[PDB]
Design a protein around this ligand. Sequence first.
Ligand SMILES: *[C@@H]1O[C@H](CO)[C@@H](O[C@@H]2O[C@H](CO)[C@@H](O[C@@H]3O[C@H](CO[C@H]4O[C@H](CO)[C@@H](O)[C@H](O[C@H]5O[C@H](CO)[C@@H](O)[C@H](O)[C@@H]5O)[C@@H]4O)[C@@H](O)[C@H](O[C@H]4O[C@H](CO)[C@@H](O)[C@H](O)[C@@H]4O)[C@@H]3O)[C@H](O)[C@H]2NC(C)=O)[C@H](O)[C@H]1NC(C)=O
Ligand SMILES: *[C@@H]1O[C@H](CO)[C@@H](O[C@@H]2O[C@H](CO)[C@@H](O[C@@H]3O[C@H](CO)[C@@H](O)[C@H](O)[C@@H]3O)[C@H](O)[C@H]2NC(C)=O)[C@H](O)[C@H]1NC(C)=O
Ligand code: NAG
Lengths: 210, 321, 191, 336, 347
Amino acid sequence: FRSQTYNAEEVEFTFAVDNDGKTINKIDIDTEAYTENGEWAIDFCPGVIRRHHGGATDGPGETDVIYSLIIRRKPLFYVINIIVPCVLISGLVLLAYFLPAQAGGQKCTVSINVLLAQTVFLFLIAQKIPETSLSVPLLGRFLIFVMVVATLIVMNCVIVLNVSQRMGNALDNICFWAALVLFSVGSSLIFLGAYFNRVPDLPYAPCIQP
Amino acid sequence: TLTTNVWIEHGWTDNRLKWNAEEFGNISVLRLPPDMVWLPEIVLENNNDGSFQISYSCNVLVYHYGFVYWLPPAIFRSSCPISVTYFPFDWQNCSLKFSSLKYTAKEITLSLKQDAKENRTYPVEWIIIDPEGFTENGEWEIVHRPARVNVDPRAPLDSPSRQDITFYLIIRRKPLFYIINILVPCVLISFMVNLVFYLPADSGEKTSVAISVLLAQSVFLLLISKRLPATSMAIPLIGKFLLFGMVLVTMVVVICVIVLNIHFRWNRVARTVDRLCLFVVTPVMVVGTAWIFLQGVYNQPPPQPFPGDPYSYNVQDKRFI
Amino acid sequence: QYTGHITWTPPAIFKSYCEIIVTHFPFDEQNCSMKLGTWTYDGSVVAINPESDQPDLSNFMESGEWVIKESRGWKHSVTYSCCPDTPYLDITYHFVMQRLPLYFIVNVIIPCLLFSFLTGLVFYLPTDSGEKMTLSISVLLSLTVFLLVIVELIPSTSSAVPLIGKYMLFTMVFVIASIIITVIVINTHHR
Amino acid sequence: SEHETRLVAKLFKDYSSVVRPVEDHRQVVEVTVGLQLIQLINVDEVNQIVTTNVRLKQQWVDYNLKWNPDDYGGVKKIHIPSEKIWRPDLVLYNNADGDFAIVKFTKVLLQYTGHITWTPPAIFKSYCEIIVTHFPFDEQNCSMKLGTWTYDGSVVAINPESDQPDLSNFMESGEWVIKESRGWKHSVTYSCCPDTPYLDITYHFVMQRLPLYFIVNVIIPCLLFSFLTGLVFYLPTDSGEKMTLSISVLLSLTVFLLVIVELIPSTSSAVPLIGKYMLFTMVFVIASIIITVIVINTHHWKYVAMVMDHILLGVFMLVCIIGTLAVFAGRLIELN
Amino acid sequence: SEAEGRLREKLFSGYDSSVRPAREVGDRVRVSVGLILAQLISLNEKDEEMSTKVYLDLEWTDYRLSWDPAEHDGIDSLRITAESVWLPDVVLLNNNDGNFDVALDISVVVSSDGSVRWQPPGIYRSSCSIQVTYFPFDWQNCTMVFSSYSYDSSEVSLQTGLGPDGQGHQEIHIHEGTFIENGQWEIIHKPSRLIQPPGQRQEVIFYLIIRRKPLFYLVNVIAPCILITLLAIFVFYLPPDAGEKMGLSIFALLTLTVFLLLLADKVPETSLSVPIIIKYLMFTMVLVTFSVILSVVVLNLHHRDWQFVAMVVDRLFLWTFIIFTSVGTLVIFLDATYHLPPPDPFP
Ligand SMILES: *[C@@H]1O[C@H](CO)[C@@H](O[C@@H]2O[C@H](CO)[C@@H](O[C@@H]3O[C@H](CO[C@H]4O[C@H](CO)[C@@H](O)[C@H](O[C@H]5O[C@H](CO)[C@@H](O)[C@H](O)[C@@H]5O)[C@@H]4O)[C@@H](O)[C@H](O[C@H]4O[C@H](CO)[C@@H](O)[C@H](O)[C@@H]4O)[C@@H]3O)[C@H](O)[C@H]2NC(C)=O)[C@H](O)[C@H]1NC(C)=O
Ligand SMILES: *[C@@H]1O[C@H](CO)[C@@H](O[C@@H]2O[C@H](CO)[C@@H](O[C@@H]3O[C@H](CO)[C@@H](O)[C@H](O)[C@@H]3O)[C@H](O)[C@H]2NC(C)=O)[C@H](O)[C@H]1NC(C)=O
Ligand SMILES: *[C@@H]1O[C@H](CO)[C@@H](O)[C@H](O)[C@H]1NC(C)=O
């Protein structure tokens, strides 16, 4: 917030003072009527008054009030409708190894059809995520990792079938364990970053009192 | 809806605004707010959204001999009824129709601007376009751009609907995007069904392939039906091709089912029916595909903008008085 | 100010027309311009002078998809055959913006690469597996489904074929040829 | 016309629209407020916004706008532009993202007694908490808190015209039925000011969804996929198509999930009941795939695998029916 | 224009555009309302909203605006900006977006006897109840309700405008060589009526009865569903040994689901009734589900003389499914075809 017309030597801001005499240096929200948003929650809302000079030679002073809404996503919708389906779909890939390595076996069939389902999920996710390139989302990284791993399982099953149709069970077992360990560790590492990078503890008072 | 950025060059004479320049320090031109002078109040009649008037009220230039010149820029969204028949190789006959609602044909007369060469005047019967500054649209090319003053003899002379000036944009679609992203994939996937007959019956995938191609055609039909209006007066050429292709894919599914029902009863009979139906359906597919697509490929706007009028309405064809 | 000096700093939202070049998409650089001038006054009654050689980027909020590589304003004066004496003046600002390609690398390039890889792998798969045809058909279907994303992300401009669009068409043709060749090989093995 | 021209000229020669239309500044202007609901335009569960078409009738007496009818040929009422007179500044306190106040300044009917009736139209985008848990069979209590923004109850008192909103001109909504409606006036007190009350009128409407559409377009396909899920255990292993069937049913459910997301609200406040049912069906298909893989591995013991198939077919079909009933029958009974 | 300027200055001396032109206190201003349809812009079944571009044709007498032309240089009519005269606040009552007023206040024409004629353009989005039941073969009956927002029937009296012959041409006017025809809707009946109140206001209601041209939905939806149904039929002719019966049937279901995703972008969202095309989609999905179930039954018989029993059961299922499919589709198509726009706008 700033005055459009007047510089800092003409109009100056101060925060209002509550009936206790304490300055309300933050966004004010009334607990008894405020309805939370269906997607986001408000954690902190500090206000600061800033002063600078617009003229590089210390010309006329400028001033503004900046309020920092720290808001947090509610992930439940994405967990239920996106994350859990994608995780279980990607878990279905591992069952390709248990399937027989002989005619009638559908190892590659299952793997590629699961990848096609993951591609439909790719469409669904691409509908939601913004197109900015400053960073790659956790969900996008997980999706890409899943698709890569699925292609690797397809390659491994093709190799197993080529060897069988010329060790099949041993290769199937070792590749199954390798893929399971790799998938579990990769998914855990991808998701865990959101735990450490959750909304930090901050010196500000909470925006909504208990 | 056609959205265009245009500059509408008005000119008229107002003898109340004459002056001798030498009496006023050789001022030969004056710039005035349009709210000060009388205006002919011309509007885009066939607009689509209720924006009848010009967007930016810039100054009028009044010259000492009484000529009032105005060049208001405007963004217009006109109603252009689409013809989908040969899509994507289609061309559209859009127009902008300008008239006055405040004044009828008895109070103001609409006419086209006259230019001059070798002291011979000729009317400007076309849309002006900068030959070097004009950035072409990414999907449409302007083929003709005539202008006509229209007068309706059956309308009352004291009604505003009697006279108007219509500028026509005959525009051609650039098909390369749709060829690359739609036409070639769809045609190749459709032709893939011709290999369904060739695949051995023991493979156990012929119906799978055929139905998967039907699914792909369904996806393309979804996309195209999203991209085109649901006009019922005609079927788009790509739509006709998709319908014909889906019909043939259904028929190939039927034939494959018959062949497999024979095979598992006979194997030589099944193979012979496969090959015969291949040699029947594949050339029929090719001929139908060519008959469809060539009808659009040779689709072009006529060489004259108005059929039955030999005039070209073109810059090199200056119709001197 | 008492000297008669007026400073006016109106905000505006400009939607300028820019000739987008799509050939190198997504790694493209766009030179986009803003031609400003007095509409009705000519250079003999109002002269406009650029404040500085460059636009002021001090308050520029950084964009999430384009980086401004450079910017520059040039004043131009043009002469016309009506009028030997009166110039017409404009100031054309321009900005060279470079796209950040990472989003399109993630969401478009990698799926196409994976589909190409699968279309390659389908040839190491034995004929006796019977998965060949199912594999190639599934890859074709997945590519067709992803085409519904591609046509949304790729610009529909027919001015030129985008490089990513050329790669998409290459992948499509490669899958089609792989299917045809798989059919040929299957028929050969059953001979 | 001549009489009415004279009357309007004489009424507004020295009228001030700034100050309240009382004779004595200690008097309270009493405004009667009536809400007529013409059409319930939209309910947005995602953004929690209710869009309604209303007429907001306001009635009050302006002390300075009296006249004697016999002075003006028997003119007993006139219509005047509402911009000329003082008006109460009713504001929609829970405005979401529309206009806070009236913006269509229609004509005011003025009677010789000074009684003014104003009936401006408005579109209200009110904010209300949406409870999506039972969706689509849910009902919403959504309200419109109206009050004077800058006048307190000691200078302008607002009174509801009737204890219920006017629904005589209400157009029937195609997706929501107004179960009931009611207007309550409230008078809050604050610790600054024992004397001056602050007044509002909160209208509220309890509206119920008509779920049929979501039954046909969402629930029925999901039910069909759930029913087709267990059918794989009836399919013999010798066919080899068990995996093909299960995987292709999974794929069709995944494609229909796009339609579901396009149709159902993407709210994160709670999972809608149809969202529960969709996730249940997805998990059920995935489990059926796992069980099919286990049965195939067992068969490659044949009699054991067949008996397992016969048991699991019944188990899965019973789980399907039980889940469908536990989802929908309870809420149907509540509606019954 | 000396005479026009002087006459114009004369007429508006002491005029008040806010006061209606009733000479006596009990007098009513008669207003003729006519409508010219320039373009039926669209009909939206999701919003239940019809968008039209129209010219109103409002006529009334303002006694204050009469003059003797022989005195004022023979000027027999005058064109005046509409803001400067009294206008009836005729508005579209049943508008859907809160836009009551005309799009542009063009000038009125005043005759020397005081007849004022005003033909303002309007873009309107009226609400229109949609007969979803027979979509896409449906016809709709949309209304535009024009009335004064302020004045009672004791102050302004509405009536339908006459035709060029002076007949009671109570219709929407449509010039053949000017009307912008709509690619999906055909105008059939276009009457108008004056509605008397049961403090009360009259209304003029103009009716557009419009028929949907069904060719697009026939080509893009109905024919694909017929083809899918035929494939679901021929599923039963594929022998069990082919090993593609599940593949074929479930991929048919998937294609049907894709066409459902297609149609869901088009159908009305209201739940007052089920579209006949939606009924057809649900019926086809049920048919595909039954084809899957019966194919699984046949396969369960085959894998157990059991092959001959399975083949006979497959033949029986083929014929029974043929019968059920034909009955259902025939009933659906007959019901969709026999629904037709009525010969009378007020049956
Ligand atoms: C793009 O789209 C535009 C439309 O916006 C197309 O323009 C149209 O082109 C066609 C063909 O060139 C035009 O048809 C001709 O139009 C003239 C108009 O003359 C006018 O003035 C006459 C008096 O001088 C008057 O008689 C005319 O009235 C005619 O039409 C009415 C309506 O049916 C009829 O009642 C009358 O009796 C007249 O026939 C009209 O006001 C007209 O004179 C031409 O008629 C001759 O030719 C036809 C044969 O086509 C014949 O039947 C007639 O007897 C007569 O010999 C003819 O109709 C049309 O008017 C144009 N519309 C415009 C400009 O708005 C344009 O062609 C498109 N370009 C493309 C597709 O490239
Ligand atoms: C299109 O819809 C309008 C309403 O939106 C229909 O108008 C209605 O028509 C019916 C039948 O003519 C009218 O009923 C009449 O009632 C009187 C009084 O009881 C009776 O004397 C008549 O015999 C008749 O039954 C009804 O009042 C009228 N409503 C309105 C508002 O005009 C119109 O008929 C519909 N058109 C079609 C083709 O269905
Ligand atoms: C106008 O132009 C003429 C010719 O150039 C010149 O003599 C004269 O001084 C100018 N000034 C005025 C005021 O006329």
